[PDB]
Assembly symmetry: C2
Homo-oligomer: 347 residues x 2
Amino acid sequence: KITLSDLPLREELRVDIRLNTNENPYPPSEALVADLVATVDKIATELDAVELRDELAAYITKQTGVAVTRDNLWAANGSNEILQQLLQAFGGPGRTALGFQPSYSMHPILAKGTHTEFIAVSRGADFRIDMDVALEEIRAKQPDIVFVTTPNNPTGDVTSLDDVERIINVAPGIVIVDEAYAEFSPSPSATTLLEKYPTKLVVSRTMSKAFDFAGGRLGYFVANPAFIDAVMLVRLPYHLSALSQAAAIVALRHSADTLGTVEKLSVERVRVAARLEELGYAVVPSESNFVFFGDQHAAWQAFLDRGVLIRDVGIAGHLRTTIGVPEENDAFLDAAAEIILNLSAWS
Amino acid sequence: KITLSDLPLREELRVDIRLNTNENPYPPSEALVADLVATVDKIATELRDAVELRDELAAYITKQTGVAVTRDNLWAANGSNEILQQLLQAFGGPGRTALGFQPSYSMHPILAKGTHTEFIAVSRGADFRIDMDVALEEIRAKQPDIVFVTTPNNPTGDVTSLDDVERIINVAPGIVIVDEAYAEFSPSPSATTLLEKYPTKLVVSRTMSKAFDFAGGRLGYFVANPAFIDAVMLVRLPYHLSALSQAAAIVALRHSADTLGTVEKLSVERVRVAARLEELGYAVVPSESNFVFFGDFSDQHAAWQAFLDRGVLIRDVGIAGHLRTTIGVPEENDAFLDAAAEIIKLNLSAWSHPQFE
């Protein structure tokens, strides 16, 4: 009986209240569900994602205030797939992508699958991008792709558009601004910078943190139309099924009810962060649906013992709690107050 | 005007009766639709690696092929292209090659470009079957890391025997992907029967999108030794397949019995359409898919226009002298055969203007 070692693999490849995944805990609207079931019924009975892209452009126009059309919009099965496609067109063998740590956007499987070398530059002690290092490294390394995540995961930190523009101007290739968590932030979108940096800027977005549509998922990006032409050369034909498209379309036409719940999540974040600081925790200012706090795996166990699952992102001294409904949020705040000591590391 | 040349692109990247896409034209069962809407409602209201879908796919394949498999032999992705991409990422890629037999639709050029696998093509013989001497010679010569065999083949409809497949496997040094996208319509046994014997080499690729119809869901999958699931797990995008996509595929699978009845009906109709084309005087490649590949036209695009003029959309696959008609409902099939009859005595020609620079 055979193991992986026997196959010709490429050699380089050798409980109750859960606030640990960064998703919208609120139930979907009756009108959403109703539209969903009626749309599947119609599609189930049988009579490049143009319609979905119209809808995504509409959603972004109203969300960001930047007027875009389907020509600026590109959809895939998820954010990882959006990024894969961009790395295939603009990264890959002999090319590099540079990002700022800690970040969840540059998943290692993307490098391996696309053969793009990933370069990491540490954020500063405040978990914010250190602009002097950032611009020096980009100028040193001439990376083909620069990633900026804002708001950042796991830290929640936003980077100003002025700083983003700085990064774009020194960046020789493309820049992917990852706004997965942008819905929860009051700050303006980098979509406002597209007109000025058409050959460079791609704004990456997702429906999977704010929306909830029968377990649908959708990653998308906003860019100059030429970027759509580019990823069309690498995208898998019929990558996006009619079903996936339809269901994303339904979610997007009920986005008004979705944006009400993200408003509620955003207000609750401000609260949870403040209270953590009262309790004496050091909390990175956030504009996401989560908080990054501490000064840890032991602490993570403590919370779990009290029936509260948050996330250990493997970053020393800190843990990430995603904002939930208020009862969940208080239940978290209870555990955290009492969770505040040393203990040594063995081999 | 800003264009694609202004971006830092990788330099190598620089009517009524439609019988032209190879899908099942029959309506879904009321029970299917009912289950689908109830499932989505349940999932929509909100109470690791597609394990449940894979249990159900394994059950399907066990019944269909007769070869006993579990979820550990089964791997699911959004479609066949995605299944192939993942395999090429694990087993192909920079410095490696994949060899196929033309004409075939399985090795899409975008797969080569996205994965950086070099594709090699070997021509099928004058009968549109794999010419085994040339096949085995070229595998020997090239030592390709991946060999593709599509059976039934698209666009030709031709099946390759398991004996010939085994010959190909034994000379192939890397892996062999047998693409059985169209297998449901064929009476011949599945290469899943060969899995036990060739665990380190053989992957059988399958899809639901030709036979099933489930709210515009799509689902590609493969059947193999469990070690192959371990392999593609290293390259697959986490959460590549949505709960929704999985759910819907599971509903289609639990109503398979209804779907298999409609494929039976499509398969009987194929035998008819093919025979009648041969009566009319058309040369028809023996098929076991849901389509027929026929002609010896002078200008086959002209012929394609003729059919369309008569309200019948078939497919021009850009192969000289031939066109591909996918089998539909019997009325559609007769409507096709009518036009086919009229067309076989015309001396159609419709040259285009040439390329002005």
